[PDB]
Amino acid sequence: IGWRREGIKYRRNELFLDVLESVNLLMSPQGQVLSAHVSGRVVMKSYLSGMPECKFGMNDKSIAIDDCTFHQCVRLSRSISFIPPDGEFELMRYRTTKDIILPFRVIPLVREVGRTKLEVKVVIKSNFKPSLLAQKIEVRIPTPLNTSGVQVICMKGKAKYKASENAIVWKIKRMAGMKESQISAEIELLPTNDKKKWARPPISMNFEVPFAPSGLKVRYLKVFEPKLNYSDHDVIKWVRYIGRSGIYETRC
């Protein structure tokens, strides 16, 4: 075993699991999902006495994994089984497409006003238990190149027009499950080349949520060391989930 030495000792035997997932979406203006997927990895941080035999179990047949590689130390077939390296390492990588929780729904509305103004209202809805908070929320709304100026009103958060980047950027520190928020913007237009139709790019979002969008959920982590005089019940165990946007585009 060339990834872990033999005489390791700790007064306090503790591990930490991180389930880290990126969730990706492309949605039509109607509300059809054109494309969606999750990339995820499990990271372990282990301060454990000896050379222990850990067994890792999740709800894996309960949601549906499309494929996944593992670390050297994993012995194949099922629940997963290994003697971990000490400290921090990558236990597995994985992908999932069926049955994804999409944390946010984006509902755009756009109206033209002669050749002089655009009217835009965007509504975000959060879709998860109310006991949980999303944080670090950005909503990016693109503006035409003939844009002369922009007014916004928003009851929650803060929004500036960023002329360099040709976009309105709306930021929110935190927001809870099953809620609704809206922004309005009036976009003042310069006159333009007449047969230039605007190709309306997507509205895109960023966020972080404390659950796995894939549905995945940790069911046991069991530690057994036969030589030494601590059992499973002696180990102090912790889990966290961090689900973050990848590409999350909603077409207007």
Partner: peptide, 6 residues
């Protein structure tokens, strides 16, 4: 932010 699992 780390939930007891023990």
């Amino acid at each position: 932010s780390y939930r007891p699992y023990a």
